[PDB]
Design a protein around this ligand. Sequence first.
Ligand code: ZN
Ligand code: ZN
Ligand code: ZN
Ligand code: ZN
Lengths: 77, 77, 64, 64, 146, 146
Amino acid sequence: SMQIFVKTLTGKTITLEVEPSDTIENVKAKIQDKEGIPPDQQRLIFAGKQLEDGRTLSDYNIQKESTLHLVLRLRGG
Amino acid sequence: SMQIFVKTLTGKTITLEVEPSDTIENVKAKIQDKEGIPPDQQRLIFAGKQLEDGRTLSDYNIQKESTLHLVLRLRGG
Amino acid sequence: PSFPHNAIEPCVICQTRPKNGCIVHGKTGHLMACFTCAKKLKKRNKPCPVCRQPIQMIVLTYFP
Amino acid sequence: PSFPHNAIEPCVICQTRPKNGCIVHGKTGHLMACFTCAKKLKKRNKPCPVCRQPIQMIVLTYFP
Amino acid sequence: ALKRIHKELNDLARDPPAQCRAGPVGDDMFHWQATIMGPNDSPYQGGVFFLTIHFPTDYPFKPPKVAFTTRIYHPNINSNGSIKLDILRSQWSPALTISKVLLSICSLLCDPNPDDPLVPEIARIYKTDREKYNRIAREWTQKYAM
Amino acid sequence: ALKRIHKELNDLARDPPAQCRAGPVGDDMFHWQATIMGPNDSPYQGGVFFLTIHFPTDYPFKPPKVAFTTRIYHPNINSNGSIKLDILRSQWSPALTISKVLLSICSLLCDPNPDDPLVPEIARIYKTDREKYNRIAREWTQKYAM
Ligand SMILES: [Zn+2]
Ligand SMILES: [Zn+2]
Ligand SMILES: [Zn+2]
Ligand SMILES: [Zn+2]
């Protein structure tokens, strides 16, 4: 349906083919397929917000040619 | 002193820095350093003639920007 | 510094899939075939096509 | 299929040497640092910078 | 370290993360100032938050030292500006950049960890009364970050 | 196999080797004819030698079948044109190409192995009387390859 971009940890940009109804879990599964990064090590950021696994691209107003930012799993304490 | 070319097994061409007095053994050691191929599995060819380990580049009239052809060690039987 | 411009060329065996099947032997590896073709070589107990060292393992290689 | 165009970009750590230090973990490897920097990571007890899997071995990677 | 730090500085000029900027204080490439704008819709909105960054000599094998200079109301950031965040300690990666660290910190603002807090009193208020948490964070943003 | 064979054929068309040529016999991509010029300084000098190449269906995992059509005097090549050469059998590599095989066969002409021969009578003459070996090889070159 639409292309979205992911700026990966190294600054490499990859293209995903997605539906707005796709779960964040499915986007991380696609990143694992392209990059060999386990989902549990992926933290995706859009508009400064971390993207939660059970929510969808549409839930974060992620549209055609939006760029998701991939950082490493982190824990504040 | 001079640059020579090696057309490696895949057809990729590499550059060596050599002396005409260099042993064929030393040229294979330099190929090992650049491409990770053990000397004993290298066969270098320059006029349909194999180059023998204890002889020198000068013994085969190999000059500036000559192209050596790398195949795999072989034996007739 | 010598950069691998040939890394983008397809698998030298099948001429289709990317060079993502690294042939590992000790502390060195030869990356010139896809994972599928490399796994065929390992499965049939064939040595490295380029250096003839025995194949320790095939590594599905990413450029992150 | 899509090929690794980023393969010719330098080591992400030292920004100088080629990506020839493959970080191996299980059946996969991440190639984005040189062998020198990769040996520093293993020596200093670091996991894979990109996926945090333990570094099983560093492989000096050639592109025949 | 210096060439890697130069590379990161060039990346921030060309393509910075939306709400994040960073650069050397003066002559010293190992001492940076950074800014995070308060994320939209957060109680930090309209706020600008300054941080200091000290790169160690063996960067990027060792993490940068990052601390807030601007006061901020948050369970994982104290009044001295110390950030208790695993990627600044044992879970650092040499593949992380200042750009990715600032984006990571920005995401910590929108989704705190109250369960293992640096400031227990703030964590308690976050869990029990989110609107009170947001009110105090908004008051601190107006008072300290404008 | 077909795509790899096509790729090799395109390389031979685009960048032809000096003393080696190879291409399909008509419309069967798995059956080629090749020519090798007699190496300079060898008793094969000024000779053109025709070979047949049959690619197996699982090329390049399995070697091509290569045989001389032109009769040639050599201890490791019989009068049926069979080449007893390790890279055509157990020491084949899928990284070898027809180009590299023909270059390899050319180097076998200048560097015979009489110790483990295909033709013992020719091996005996090679070891005991090199000038006689060379005379006979030169006569066969004139008779068959010119
Ligand atoms: Zn393949
Ligand atoms: Zn190898
Ligand atoms: Zn490096
Ligand atoms: Zn990894």
